[model samples]
Target chain A: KWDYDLRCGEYTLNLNEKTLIMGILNVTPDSFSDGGSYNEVDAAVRHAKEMRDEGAHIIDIGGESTRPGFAKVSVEEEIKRVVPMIQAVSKEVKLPISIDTYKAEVAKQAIEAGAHIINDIWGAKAEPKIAEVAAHYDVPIILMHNRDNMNYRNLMADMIADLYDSIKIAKDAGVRDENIILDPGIGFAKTPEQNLEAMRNLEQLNVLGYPVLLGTSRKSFIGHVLDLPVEERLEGTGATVCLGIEKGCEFVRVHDVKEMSRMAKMMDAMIGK
Target chain B: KWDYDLRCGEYTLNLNEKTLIMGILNVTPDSFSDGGSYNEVDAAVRHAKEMRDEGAHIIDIGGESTRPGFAKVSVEEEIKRVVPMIQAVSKEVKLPISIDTYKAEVAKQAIEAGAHIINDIWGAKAEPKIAEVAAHYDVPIILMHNRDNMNYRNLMADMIADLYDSIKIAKDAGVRDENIILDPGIGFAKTPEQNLEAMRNLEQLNVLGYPVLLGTSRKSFIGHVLDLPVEERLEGTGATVCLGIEKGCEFVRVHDVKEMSRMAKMMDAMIGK
Candidate 1:
């Protein structure tokens, strides 16, 4: 029960042996939190290397900003922003890289430029061809649940059903089951209360029998609950990460790699990984 | 099922609504870790005031060191060290005070001076009159599981039985059930592996039907497991506190009050306390 191997072309990650850390590298100038600090290729590459040294198992590179009211980048501009980051980080860091995007061309180009995974925020439904890209590259695809609105017959069941739709798209596109990771989309398309209910019932997602990735780091939900800014949400993020570990999530995406990684290690040691 | 009221005279804590943080106040000159930092009454009172401002629900003041190989102190000396601190802190801080002692005379003197609870490391087995002291004062008593050695036929079962002995001591001495707390003694006589096993199965202590207090703050097991020194074990302590909250612990004793209180708040928000 504690063994799921994620084959990322040049590396392998066992999901059950340890909770993996996926450090976020936001490359967009309009990213809400980082405020364009790491928009340069050299700075993004340096951040990736630092996260690698701080015990990150994966580095997620994203070109476009996904926060609410964030301005979107064209596919060509997004590629220009992320491809150089992928190439530069690939030359120095040995950790597997994940490209976070919902655009098919961005996913394809990023994979071609040395990215090893596809993290689609729209669960491959924003552009179904992204699943095809994942299939072509034989890389892991993280399917995050999202919606046009918050309307739902039931929150978790509806979200799980939506994730099933994403899974079906990947299967139809010839993506292997082992290459699929499901994210519940903590901060996307849900109210703060719904986000908490999702985390409380997070283990219900395990019926899908795929490794789960939790992305509650510095989210608006934590900010809403703790009444703190993004910069001061490390302990709040840690609480969610510990709860995620207890509820059987296999991966966590976080911005504070050093603190969250230490929290994850202590959690894995306290409870079994 | 989640409703517990610990009436600490001046204040009543609802353990089910929020996890309580008991800030550790070491006042012994021979305390292994703190090394007499707060040995004087003024410093100890200042530390108590600081923890009160930092969201600590209770302040635990101990005179004699309980660490391994700690030199035993006479009751007069122990009472002299803790009573003055308790009197001074009670004059300023409104938080409840727990006297960490196994000697009945010491507990009695501290309570008479202004303490609210009796925390016996030997579970009242060292001096059964401590239960009488708790019974007479009508105060909450913390019974921590400890042994003369590491012998056990079944680890959790034996520990529960030992706790049952403590409970019987309290009950026989006329201490009310509502005023008894159980601590599994994270670093007393058990080995590091056994401590982990106790924590993983901590819910087994629920059979006794008392509020559980977890005391894994900067203990040797965390240091041994994380390869960290005592001062640097905050993240490690956070991990144990998170797991303890997940496994139905209502109270946590910690030295890092601000961080742990924040952690408990977030964990309470994520999963209902």
Candidate 2:
């Protein structure tokens, strides 16, 4: 019924004309929005269930804080923070759990605790062993394009090249093509202008033949542009979600589950998919 | 420095690869959001100024209520309702005034009273003279895709064909290609599914080589998809705004000014325009 199928290990996620919504569940105290909201085991389980009931297809659980200028948590702390939540939510919900961590140790522990996917924010560069962990667990690995260096000859072209290299790293680590997803990294290290350019030319990244995941929920760039605090970025985030769907993105990682899910569905219907 | 350039009338607006935000200013008494707030002339002027100050590129002013099954107003009543608001705001704000009316008579009076563009909801089919007036005035006109008969051989194909026909009518009436814009008309005459499909496939319409304007702010399709009431669709609306920018939409028509504008700018920044 659709043109493309997203194959993640034994699970063939069918998203040819359908858009998938991945809800953000931050278990860190310093995560951007909803900080410490789901830090506890009981609260995390309740929140995951609520998002699943609201139409979230996947729950992306992040343990460490990646907000700009924030201190990074140690491997022990990161594992301690997310393992309990992932283990608890895995048993509580039928949906897939995606661990948003770049460290191989965190990914290994999260997969062992029952997370179905690894969302590497550093595109497998932060921890080279992350790809091996993904390969070992036989789970899909999301390699997002990010950089400590902001300079580029051409933003989109360079991003594609970076992602192509990431693909090589994943393949070298025994990761299969069907087990890799590419995220453009909307709010990562890029400047505001580069971020907008990435969003506009997202279709180029989709041409890499991997499912593209866009995460732009309540980002600081949105705060800078709209001149609003974090809580008021919902409308801005919704606009990006619809744009992502229109440009053939397979999945969107967002904080507002119910709203973005509805937007994704409506956009898919309009495309006649 | 941007990938795309949008020219409207004498003003050549450039997104520089960024999303353009068109803030909604409804002068009707019964819009789902901000209905009574903008019904008065002073309030409407103040609201428009606030949106402009908050970085809105265009101010879209609508008089008659277009909410589903709502009572239609007479042409005289509609003209009275919007003319004062447009006149007051056009003098106070520096942004372009887009009169959202399908009636030819109302558009003519609004244009005469200081409106810069005619945003016809009926796509010139509601009143044949509407296109003629636009041509005579030599102002830009947004020819939206709409139909009295919702039946289609293929929803997207039929919609594109209908928009093609509208373009032909505009050109024949002396409206140049440079002075024309196309809107997909989400929630106008299509079902929720069809509306969603249209939103996803808006780029197909944009391939027509005209500026594309997307208006998906808090429509019924969002409500139906999210199972949310009208007032709670801001996050849904924001997702569409971001998606529209990503999909190459030149302008987004939205009710929430501060939120949508910020989202558009952030999406622009990510795209590195």
Candidate 3:
């Protein structure tokens, strides 16, 4: 039940027609779950390279802090934070790179610097220009279902509708249908119970006809449900990723790339690779 | 949809309509997953208490090594190896205790010494008297689908039929219907491909109308799938537990009880209480 490939630049990721592994590499200083310092350029590139070696099909590099109680960084500062690391990681590995950002300038600079995918948190709702750059470069854009607040009369209905809105934006931007990927932004705009509901109904997202990327690695909902600290949520993360793949997620954005990779492949074998 | 409670002698485990955890406690020196020692009685007892505190519902005690390349021990030696540990562990923790053995004499001795469940790898197939002992004690018996040879006319169908064959013996021996459990022996007398097929086809076993137990904890099957050694198969084990629960397997026998407990609970939360 996999989509076979996500065409990004010159990179054609086979993913073996199963859920792919996308390792999280935060080059910023405040990534919420695990912060990445700006001074550690070599460390970020090294981690990205190692994640590629560790069976990560794609590496997602984020320069902005999007955690709860996070401060915004300047567009110039965000570009300065992730571009050089992306270029270095691109030089070191053949795997596709994804830039996790909402800013059009940061997304543009990152793609030109070697990132092949644009992971937009706003889903092209914040800056329509972001979709323009993705269309211009013809790279895949992962639009996560996010909102301004947690208010929803019907959670699942509203969430799916919101994703349709993002898809409309992608189509209007001249982004090819195959170049679009969807993410059910688990922790961005919902309560712990609501996030669980979203995860529980991920099949609704799958019915949207685009590949879904689940980013439930060490999120607050997992920690909140388990009453565990961030550092102790690897098993919880594994649980979500397993269930997500079973619910038909095509890719998982995770911090524990190696462990999740093994677990996901095991689940894949069970689901029939 | 768990079956709520497991009725053990002098104890009722409030598995509370969710999948239960059974932590493996091997007290032998030749365990393939974890090397154990008969002299380490206190260590086993301590670990049993720790597993109890870490949310284990049933603590399964095994004296003889049943791993692939395991050696057979005398009945008296096996009883001596596990009775003390069970008695000590029973006093230390309030969880129900399961004695893992195929010999009726060792099972009876351990039950008399405080064990509450009979976990027979042979499914009363190798030794029919083991079911009689369970019937005599009026305790639940975990009948694992094991064979002397890997030759299967039809792996899943014959395995289910073989388990039904054990059930007939249990019923003939006066074992009650409610006091029975089923385990698909993942790594016993099967090739690597056979193990994967068994795990994938576990739901077929669930059709037999009994609470199913999955014991793929750091077993050779997980090691084979992950290409990892016994020491590093936690995440792979975690994956099987997650999907197994989703497939309606009710109990999991594991080595890392704390991590798997969290994962199974998280999975239960998603799949519903």
Output the number of the lDDT-best candidate: 1
- Ten-residue stretch with the least lDDT total in model 1 chain B: B28-37
Clashes of each: 0, 39, 0
User: Alpha-carbon error at B51 in model 1, in Å?
Assistant: 0.4
lDDT values, one for every candidate: 0.88, 0.78, 0.84
Error of 1 at B99 (Å): 0.2
Sort every candidate by DockQ, greatest first. Answer: 1, 3, 2
In model 2, how large is the Cα lDDT of residue B161? 88
lDDT for B178 in candidate 3 is: 85
Interface RMSD of every predicted model, in angstroms: 1.0, 3.4, 1.1
- Native contacts retained, all candidates in order: 0.71, 0.71, 0.81
Model 3, span A1-273: residue lDDT tens:
445567776788764566799999876453432322445777887788789888999898877544432457678666666777887889988888998888888889988898999999899999989999999999999999998999999999999999999999989989988889999899989998998898888888878888889999898888887999999999999999999988888899999988899999888877777
Q: Whose lDDT is higher: candidate 1's or candidate 3's?
A: 1
Q: List-wise, what DockQ does each model earn?
A: 0.75, 0.43, 0.72
Candidate number that wins on TM-score, 2 or 3: 3
| Cα lDDT of model 1 by residue, B1-273, tens digit | 645688998888887788999999987353453222344667888899999999999999887645433556678666666788888888889989999888999899989999999899999999999999999999999999998999888999999999999999999999989999999998888999898888888889887889999999998888887788989898889989998998889899999999999989988988865
Proportion of the native interface contacts kept in model 1? 0.71
